[PDB]
RNA sequence: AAACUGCGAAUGGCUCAUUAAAUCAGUUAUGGUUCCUUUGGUCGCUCGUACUUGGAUAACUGUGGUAAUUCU
RNA sequence: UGGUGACUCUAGAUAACCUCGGGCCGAUCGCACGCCGGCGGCGACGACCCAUUCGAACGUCUGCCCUAUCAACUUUCGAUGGUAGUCGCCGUGCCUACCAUGGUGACCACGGGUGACGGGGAAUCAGGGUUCGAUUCCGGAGAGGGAGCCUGAGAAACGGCUACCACAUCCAAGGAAGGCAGCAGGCGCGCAAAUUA
RNA sequence: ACUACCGAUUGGAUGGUUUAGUGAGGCCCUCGGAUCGGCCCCGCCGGGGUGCCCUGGCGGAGCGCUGAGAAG
């Protein structure tokens, strides 16, 4: 069913899947109600989260996290983990003895919700700070924009 | 003792780090509560801040819910059949959170017959004590028989719940965490969750 | 540390207490109470350093535990009891009443008030919540909980409350054009009318305030205490009226005062 | 070995030194609060149990 | 006086061995937690011998043990 | 109902549960005594919960000296991520089970060193810098070395306890007691530092 | 005669990473049950509603029912 790929039954804790309904409603349509919310800072909840079917407890829009604290950006560099990506933040650090700059970088592991598809290497991602979700992830993807050179 | 600090582990680069302080009492871990089925034996724990944790070591009775119709009853745990974390805990009959349990179904059948007045989990022979014809086949008034008619208009439940009542023991999921609560509360499995757990149990064999 | 602290070093004390360096190594260390440690004036500093009835801390204790000092109408014998903004101090033996409000330099002025003005005080509403059985509560800036407030009273509004009973008697909204006093930050002690509140979601709001002399200054929303409705304050103000003079006009005023007398 | 004998009804007590192993075999290999008839302790202790 | 009970002894004082994104500083978060105390609120909101309940244990009295202890 | 920028918030309703190692709903103490046996004013002490105060504890972003005669490291023994739980005051590979093979690195990882506790700060001073900051304020760490607990709101406490390691005190030889990187003081060390007031 | 290096002796001791094994002491769990108390039974027995019952103090046995509980 492309949903129950685990050894426990995956469901959204807030929605109830065992409502007692009539035969006409049974023959009408078999669509579950879906829990979603807004990451309310001028961030639009995507349609793939509202109309989707996936289950992710660490998703900003459908899971159990809240976005509070910093909001940063990065470029996607690696996408080889399961529901998390590794992004890169480049910056310039000012050495004031020389009055010059050196280029520095920080690698950041962020949680990518399944509602963001067609995320490529090099696309600009906007992440927001949440509570600790694993040992090394603290930020959660909220927006994706493509690279300006790509059509 | 058991320490659940983050500084004993390695760094994100994989290098090892030196501790700058020794183990603190706010970083402690306690030995696990392997709650089992048996007559009630629970131990209270003093925790951080002078508050109380209840550590259940032997439990046999909880309360469980039909959520389709919002009715819960205090009943008995009978057996452990599935655990998504470890099958060794099924073999040891360990009560944890989200372990699949089968429980006694007598209060639920009792409420269903005292409310909807239809037989539940009954054989073709249907030999009943006279209290059951008193409950199922009482004498009522016009308003009451009418209200019962629109009550049995929708009093049809799933065939799988019928099959489990035919068997006599209901499947449920323990939703409380018993080593911290001293209770093994939960909810009766229904719907796609019920077919999931049935096919996983059958796929174990 | 292994637990909470009980001592305050004198150089680490709040600077607006105006303690000196050589009297001791310790400062009076305010008790826990309705005010923060950094935003209060303890009773020993008031009775000894400012008001000068006492010469030592032992004399402060002898004054306080003869049951002479009321704070907000309640007799206090804790010598380090944290008194703070808008708190009324009453000495019935000498017939004196005070409100702890700020100078233009950010220090608690010795502000004498009329005994009818000592009947009430103002509080800034810090939270509104509904508790069990649907009962609305407000929490003020001085740790007061009042049940059943007016439904129009919101957070950042100012209640005018009666010290005899403790109930809500009047209130003032947060609105552009109301009079306010600044209780934190670099503009501590200044008074003016609110002219613009800009909102930053997920962050601190910035309120713009205009002085009675036309000077304008901004603060955070946490630092604003609404005092009077529109233009007239609902309490007595100190000798300076919230007008921060620069160092040049303060020198000129000092020289004119020295010239006029002497 | 010495014996600290106490009598609670009149609340009176006394220390008595007895050195003969035959008199102490009535006390050996038994536990605290094990009731013993102290007959072999002396001629005056016939009906006395301790 | 003693002794039981309550509280404090987790503050203060000392030193700089450890410790290299660790500590620490500035900035943010707890919408992810605990909090003696102070202060305010709540404390006939429960439909089910009381004009006062029970057993001890110190201090005290008396007998003691060990070379020795703030032992008993 | 009420709130936030955003709740799975707060409040409401239903069905029940409510731990014997047990959650509240006062068998407590003083002073003045007074009204129509019954009604009472000040307090003190307790008290489940909520808020506040004093914190604490875990996270965010940015920032540190020398070394390549340290160039690949982490990953069986958790390394990086997912799902379910355990433990924990709580978030979390904190731990367990099953999975995926990931995570970091010439923008210097990993390793090693430092005559390295970090800052506020000090000397110099046209300016940039250079050297110093064991040391009275703030934060951390430790109590001979390790480790483990009890009590308590709070400690992995050492002017608390229990072991082992290294030292070491008394003894009738069975046993008992120990921790000055507190104030003085002593020995040692040394070029190097005060009174058992 | 002096200064400064190498050095057989697994020379003797000591420490830090580790392979294998042993492991004090606390904590948790499952037992254990020295001791200590209550109920029931009976005996010595006081009163009433007039031998039915209970009232209070002492003793006796019953692995009867139990509750607290040390060492291990």
From Swiss-Prot, chain A:
InterPro entries: NA-bd_OB-fold (IPR012340), Ribosomal_uS17 (IPR000266), Ribosomal_uS17_arc/euk (IPR028333), Ribosomal_uS17_CS (IPR019979), Ribosomal_uS17_N (IPR032440). The modification N6-acetyllysine is found at residues 37, 44, 57. One of its GO terms (biological process) is translation. The modification Omega-N-methylarginine is found at residue 68. Its main location: cytoplasm. Pfam families: Ribosomal_S17, Ribosomal_S17_N. A lipid is attached at residue 59 (S-palmitoyl cysteine). Coiled coil: none annotated. The modification Citrulline is found at residue 21. Keywords: Acetylation, Citrullination, Cytoplasm, Lipoprotein, Methylation, Nucleus, Palmitate, Phosphoprotein, Ribonucleoprotein, Ribosomal protein, RNA-binding, rRNA-binding. GO terms for molecular function: RNA binding; rRNA binding; structural constituent of ribosome. The modification N-acetylalanine is found at residue 1. It is found in: Cytoplasm; Nucleus, Nucleolus. The modification Phosphoserine is found at residues 66, 109. One of its GO terms (cellular component) is extracellular exosome. Belongs to the universal ribosomal protein uS17 family. Component of the small ribosomal subunit. Part of the small subunit (SSU) processome, composed of more than 70 proteins and the RNA chaperone small nucleolar RNA (snoRNA) U3. This is Small ribosomal subunit protein uS17. It comes from Homo sapiens (Human). The gene is RPS11.
UniProtKB/Swiss-Prot annotation, chain B:
This is Small ribosomal subunit protein eS8. Disulfide bonds: none annotated. Gene3D superfamilies: 3.10.290.70, Ribosomal protein S8e, subdomain. Component of the small ribosomal subunit. The ribosome is a large ribonucleoprotein complex responsible for the synthesis of proteins in the cell. Part of the small subunit (SSU) processome, first precursor of the small eukaryotic ribosomal subunit. During the assembly of the SSU processome in the nucleolus, many ribosome biogenesis factors, an RNA chaperone and ribosomal proteins associate with the nascent pre-rRNA and work in concert to generate RNA folding, modifications, rearrangements and cleavage as well as targeted degradation of pre-ribosomal RNA by the RNA exosome. NCBIfam families: eS8 (TIGR00307). It is a lipid-anchor. The modification Phosphothreonine is found at residue 129. One of its GO terms (biological process) is maturation of SSU-rRNA from tricistronic rRNA transcript (SSU-rRNA, 5.8S rRNA, LSU-rRNA). The modification N6-acetyllysine is found at residues 36, 127. Pfam families: Ribosomal_S8e (PF01201). Residues 7-25 have a biased composition (Basic residues). It comes from the Eukaryota. Residues 1-26 are annotated as: Disordered. Its main location: cytoplasm. There is a cross-link at residues 169, 192 (Glycyl lysine isopeptide (Lys-Gly) (interchain with G-Cter in SUMO2)).
Curated annotation (Swiss-Prot), chain C:
Keywords: Acetylation, Cytoplasm, Isopeptide bond, Nucleus, Ribonucleoprotein, Ribosomal protein, RNA-binding, rRNA-binding, Ubl conjugation. Its main location: cytoplasm. GO terms for molecular function: RNA binding; rRNA binding; structural constituent of ribosome. There is a cross-link at residue 229 (Glycyl lysine isopeptide (Lys-Gly) (interchain with G-Cter in SUMO2)). Pfam families: 40S_S4_C, KOW, Ribosomal_S4e, RS4NT. It is found in: Cytoplasm; Nucleus, Nucleolus. Gene3D superfamilies: 2.30.30.30, 2.40.50.740, RNA-binding S4 domain. One of its GO terms (cellular component) is cytosol. The modification N6-acetyllysine is found at residue 232. Transmembrane segments: none annotated. The keyword Ubl conjugation applies. One of its GO terms (biological process) is translation. Residues 41-103 form the S4 RNA-binding domain. Component of the small ribosomal subunit. Part of the small subunit (SSU) processome, composed of more than 70 proteins and the RNA chaperone small nucleolar RNA (snoRNA) U3. Identified in a IGF2BP1-dependent mRNP granule complex containing untranslated mRNAs. Belongs to the eukaryotic ribosomal protein eS4 family. HAMAP family: Ribosomal_eS4. This is Small ribosomal subunit protein eS4, X isoform.
Curated annotation (Swiss-Prot), chain D:
There is a cross-link at residue 14 (Glycyl lysine isopeptide (Lys-Gly) (interchain with G-Cter in SUMO2)). The modification ADP-ribosyl glutamic acid is found at residue 35. Ribosomal protein S6 is the major substrate of protein kinases in eukaryote ribosomes. The phosphorylation is stimulated by growth factors, tumor promoting agents, and mitogens. It is dephosphorylated at growth arrest. Mono-ADP-ribosylation at Glu-35 by PARP16 inhibits polysome assembly and mRNA loading, thereby inhibiting protein translation. It is found in: Cytoplasm; Nucleus, Nucleolus. Signal peptide: none annotated. Component of the small ribosomal subunit. Part of the small subunit (SSU) processome, composed of more than 70 proteins and the RNA chaperone small nucleolar RNA (snoRNA) U3. Component of the 40S small ribosomal subunit. Plays an important role in controlling cell growth and proliferation through the selective translation of particular classes of mRNA. Part of the small subunit (SSU) processome, first precursor of the small eukaryotic ribosomal subunit. Belongs to the eukaryotic ribosomal protein eS6 family. This is Small ribosomal subunit protein eS6. It comes from Homo sapiens (Human). The lineage of its organism: Eukaryota, Metazoa, Chordata, Craniata, Vertebrata. The gene is RPS6.
């Amino acid at each position: 069913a492309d949903i129950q790929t685990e050894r426990a039954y995956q469901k959204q804790p807030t929605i109830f899947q065992n409502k007692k309904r009539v035969l006409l409603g049974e023959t009408g349509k078999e669509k579950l109600p879906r829990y979603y919310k807004n990451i309310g800072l001028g961030f639009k909840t995507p349609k793939e989260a509202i109309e989707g079917t996936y289950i992710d407890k660490k998703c900003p829009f459908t899971g159990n996290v809240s976005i509070r604290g910093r909001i940063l950006s990065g470029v996607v560099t690696k996408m080889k983990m399961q529901r998390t990506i590794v992004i890169r933040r480049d910056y310039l650090h000012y050495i004031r003895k020389y009055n010059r700059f050196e280029k520095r970088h920080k690698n950041m592991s962020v949680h990518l919700s399944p509602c963001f598809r067609d995320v490529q290497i090099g696309d600009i991602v906007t992440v927001g700070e949440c509570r600790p979700l694993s040992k090394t992830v603290r930020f959660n993807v909220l927006k994706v924009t493509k690279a300006a050179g790509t059509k | 003792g058991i320490s659940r600090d983050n500084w004993h582990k390695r760094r994100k680069t994989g290098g090892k780090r030196k501790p700058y302080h020794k183990k603190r009492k706010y970083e402690l871990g306690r030995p696990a509560a392997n709650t089992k089925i048996g007559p009630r034996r629970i131990h209270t724990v003093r925790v951080r801040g002078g508050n109380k944790k209840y550590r259940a070591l032997r439990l046999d009775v909880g309360n469980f819910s039909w959520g389709s119709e919002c009715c819960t009853r205090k009943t008995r745990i009978i057996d452990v059949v599935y655990n998504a974390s470890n099958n060794e805990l099924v073999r040891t009959k360990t009560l944890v959170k989200n372990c699949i349990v089968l429980i006694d179904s007598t209060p639920y059948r009792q409420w269903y017959e005292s409310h909807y007045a239809l037989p539940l989990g009954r054989k073709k022979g249907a030999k009943l004590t006279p209290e059951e014809e008193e409950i199922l086949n009482k004498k009522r008034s016009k308003k009451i028989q009418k209200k019962y008619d629109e009550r049995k208009k929708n009093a049809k439940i799933s065939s799988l719940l019928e099959e489990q009542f035919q068997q006599g023991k209901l499947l449920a999921c323990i939703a409380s965490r018993p080593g911290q609560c001293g209770r093994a509360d939960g909810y009766v499995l229904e719907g796609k969750e019920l077919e999931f757990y049935l096919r996983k149990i059958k796929a174990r064999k | 540390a292994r637990g909470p602290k009980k001592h305050l070093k004198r150089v680490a004390a709040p600077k607006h207490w105006m303690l000196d360096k050589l009297t001791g190594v310790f400062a009076p260390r305010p008790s826990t109470g309705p005010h923060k440690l950094r935003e209060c004036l303890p009773l020993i500093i008031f009775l000894r350093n400012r008001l000068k009835y006492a010469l030592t801390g032992d004399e402060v204790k002898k004054i306080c535990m003869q049951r002479f000092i009321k704070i907000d109408g309640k007799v206090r014998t804790d010598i380090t009891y944290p008194a703070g903004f808008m708190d009324v101090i009453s000495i019935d033996k000498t017939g004196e009443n005070f409100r702890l409000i700020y100078d233009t330099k950010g220090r608690f002025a010795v502000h004498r008030i009329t005994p009818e003005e000592a009947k009430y005080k103002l509080c800034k509403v810090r939270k509104i919540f509904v508790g069990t059985k649907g009962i609305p509560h407000l929490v003020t800036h001085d740790a007061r909980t009042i049940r059943y407030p007016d439904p129009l009273i919101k957070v950042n509004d100012t209640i005018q409350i009666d010290l005899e009973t403790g109930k809500i008697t009047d209130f003032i909204k947060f609105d552009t054009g109301n009079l306010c006093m600044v209780t934190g930050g670099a503009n501590l002690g200044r008074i003016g009318v609110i002219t613009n509140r800009e909102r930053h979601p997920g962050s601190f709001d910035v309120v713009h305030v205009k002085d009675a002399n036309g000077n304008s200054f901004a603060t955070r929303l946490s630092n604003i205490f609404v005092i009077g409705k529109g233009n007239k304050p609902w309490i007595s103000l100190p000798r300076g009226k919230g007008i921060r003079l620069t160092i040049a006009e303060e020198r000129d005023k000092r020289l004119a005062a020295k010239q006029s007398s002497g | 070995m010495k014996l600290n004998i106490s009598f609670p009804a009149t609340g009176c007590q006394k220390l008595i030194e007895v050195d003969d192993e035959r008199k102490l075999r009535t006390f050996y290999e038994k536990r605290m609060a094990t009731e013993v008839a102290a007959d072999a302790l002396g001629e005056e202790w016939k009906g006395y149990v301790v």
